[PDB]
Design a protein around this motif. Structure first.
Motif, short mmCIF file in Angstrom:
data_model
loop_
_atom_site.label_atom_id
_atom_site.label_comp_id
_atom_site.label_asym_id
_atom_site.label_seq_id
_atom_site.Cartn_x
_atom_site.Cartn_y
_atom_site.Cartn_z
N UNK A 118 9.14 13.62 -0.30
CA UNK A 118 9.86 14.02 -1.48
C UNK A 118 9.16 15.20 -2.17
N UNK A 119 9.80 15.71 -3.21
CA UNK A 119 9.18 16.76 -3.97
C UNK A 119 8.20 16.27 -5.03
N UNK A 120 7.88 14.97 -5.04
CA UNK A 120 6.70 14.40 -5.77
C UNK A 120 6.55 12.87 -5.69
N UNK A 121 5.29 12.39 -5.81
CA UNK A 121 4.91 10.91 -5.81
C UNK A 121 4.70 10.62 -7.31
N UNK A 181 0.79 -1.23 0.00
CA UNK A 181 0.00 0.00 0.00
C UNK A 181 0.83 1.29 0.00
N UNK A 182 0.29 2.32 -0.67
CA UNK A 182 0.88 3.63 -0.76
C UNK A 182 0.72 4.25 0.62
N UNK A 183 1.50 5.27 0.96
CA UNK A 183 1.37 5.91 2.29
C UNK A 183 -0.01 6.54 2.38
N UNK A 184 -0.64 6.49 3.56
CA UNK A 184 -1.89 7.17 3.80
C UNK A 184 -1.83 8.72 4.05
N UNK A 185 -0.62 9.24 4.28
CA UNK A 185 -0.49 10.63 4.66
C UNK A 185 -0.32 11.56 3.48
N UNK A 186 -0.27 12.88 3.75
CA UNK A 186 -0.34 13.89 2.66
C UNK A 186 0.97 14.28 1.97
N UNK A 187 2.10 13.79 2.48
CA UNK A 187 3.37 14.03 1.80
C UNK A 187 3.62 12.97 0.80
N UNK A 188 4.31 13.35 -0.28
CA UNK A 188 4.83 12.43 -1.28
C UNK A 188 6.02 11.68 -0.69
N UNK A 189 6.24 10.46 -1.15
CA UNK A 189 7.34 9.63 -0.59
C UNK A 189 8.46 9.28 -1.57
N UNK A 235 4.89 6.02 7.32
CA UNK A 235 5.51 7.09 8.14
C UNK A 235 6.06 8.28 7.34
N UNK A 236 6.81 8.00 6.30
CA UNK A 236 7.32 9.08 5.41
C UNK A 236 6.17 10.01 4.87
N UNK A 237 5.02 9.39 4.61
CA UNK A 237 3.88 10.06 4.04
C UNK A 237 3.26 10.98 5.08
N UNK A 238 3.57 10.72 6.37
CA UNK A 238 3.12 11.58 7.47
C UNK A 238 4.19 12.53 7.92
#
Length: 373
Positions: free
Chosen positions: A34-37, A4-12, A114-117
């Protein structure tokens, strides 16, 4: 891509860091905002030797190694390989320790979430021979041409085990502290030449760590590693033990853990001798929480729970009675809540505070196993 992709609002984003190049350096996989998903193209198991290592661990042949490689060899995990770090923010840091027979890449469902958060996650690769396989470079020249020396899982004797497993947990805690030092050094401008030759420039990490918001998290053997690393290293502010295997730990460590500590257990892995060692960490003056995920198995914390179908999953004990996505989501959200309370984060992970208490239909507070006091 059943990971699964991260659930949070940042790109990973994802990259690997080796430094120094020796058997004594740090090797980690990094997951970061990251600066984009953009694309999600990170190779899950990046080398054929990891498959050979994995065959060894299962106790099988050269054939099984090739079959694993055929089935899983080109699988990706949803992180943007070598994407730039997102500028303008200092991130909290998690150091993640893998289980016996695993290696740095097999906990991407957690690292990526975690990264996505908004966390930087350093998943260490351990060189204690608890990893199915790992590698280093015999000298600087070998690093330069990518000429790898491989180290494979050590198999034991029924008698050897106590002392060997303790030494390993001690080496692992030291690798975790060492990875933390490496990241903190880079954060403060230490020049570092990745022994791997990768497009991500480590100088991006300068001034990008919130040096006070550091946590250690780990699974099974990595769960014991959480406990050992916390007793030694007070730069880590809290720990989360996922289905810890307490056997490796010495008698003396249980009174030596000042930081807050969260045990997230599977239902089916756990047994009284293990639980009583967890309870031994509890003290009237220390924060300890424990929850158990209903109908989950040991593998529900690792990426292999996402790698097969439901039928083959259940038979292989890679999946439990619980949906794998549901189980990883509960563990990740309980973890985030815990990290917010103990790292003092200004986010809304506190909306899951009831998870730390086991107050959900798929959760037990504490354990369903019973003991005396």
């Amino acid at each position: 891509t059943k990971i699964p992709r991260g659930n949070g609002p940042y790109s990973v984003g994802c990259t690997d860091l080796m430094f120094d190049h020796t058997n004594k350096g740090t090797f980690l996989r990094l997951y970061y905002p990251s600066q984009d998903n953009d694309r999600l193209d990170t190779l899950w198991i990046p080398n054929k030797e990891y498959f050979w290592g994995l065959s060894k661990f299962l106790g099988t042949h050269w054939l099984m190694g090739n079959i694993l490689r055929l089935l899983f060899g080109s699988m990706t995990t949803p992180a943007n390989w070598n994407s730039p770090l997102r500028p303008g923010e200092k991130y909290p840091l998690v150091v993640f320790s893998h289980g016996l027979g695993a290696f740095r890449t097999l906990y991407s469902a957690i690292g990526i979430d975690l990264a996505s958060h908004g966390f930087i996650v350093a998943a260490v690769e351990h060189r204690d021979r608890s990893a199915s396989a790992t590698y280093y470079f015999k000298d600087q020249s070998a690093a330069e041409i990518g000429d790898k020396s491989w180290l494979y899982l050590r198999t034991l004797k029924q008698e050897e085990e106590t002392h060997i497993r303790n030494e390993q947990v001690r080496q692992r805690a030291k690798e975790c502290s060492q990875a933390l030092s490496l990241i903190l050094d880079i954060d403060h401008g230490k020049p570092v030449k990745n022994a791997l030759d990768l497009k991500f420039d480590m100088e991006q990490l300068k001034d990008s760590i919130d040096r006070e918001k550091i946590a250690v998290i780990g699974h099974s053997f990595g769960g014991a590693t959480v406990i050992q690393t916390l007793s030694e290293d007070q730069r880590f502010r809290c720990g989360i033990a996922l289905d810890a295997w307490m056997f490796p730990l010495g008698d003396e460590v249980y009174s030596r853990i000042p930081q807050p500590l969260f045990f997230i257990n599977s239902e089916y892995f756990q047994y009284p001798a293990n639980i009583i060692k967890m309870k031994k960490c509890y003290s009237p003056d220390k924060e300890r929480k424990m929850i158990t995920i209903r109908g989950s198995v040991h593998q529900n914390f690792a990426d292999f729970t996402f790698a097969t179908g439901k039928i083959i999953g259940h038979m292989l004990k890679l999946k439990g009675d619980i949906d794998s996505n549901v189980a990883i989501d509960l563990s990740n959200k309980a973890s985030l809540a815990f990290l917010q309370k103990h790292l003092g984060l200004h986010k809304d992970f506190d909306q899951w505070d009831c998870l730390i208490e086991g107050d959900d239909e798929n959760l037990i507070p504490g354990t369903n196993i019973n003991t005396t006091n």
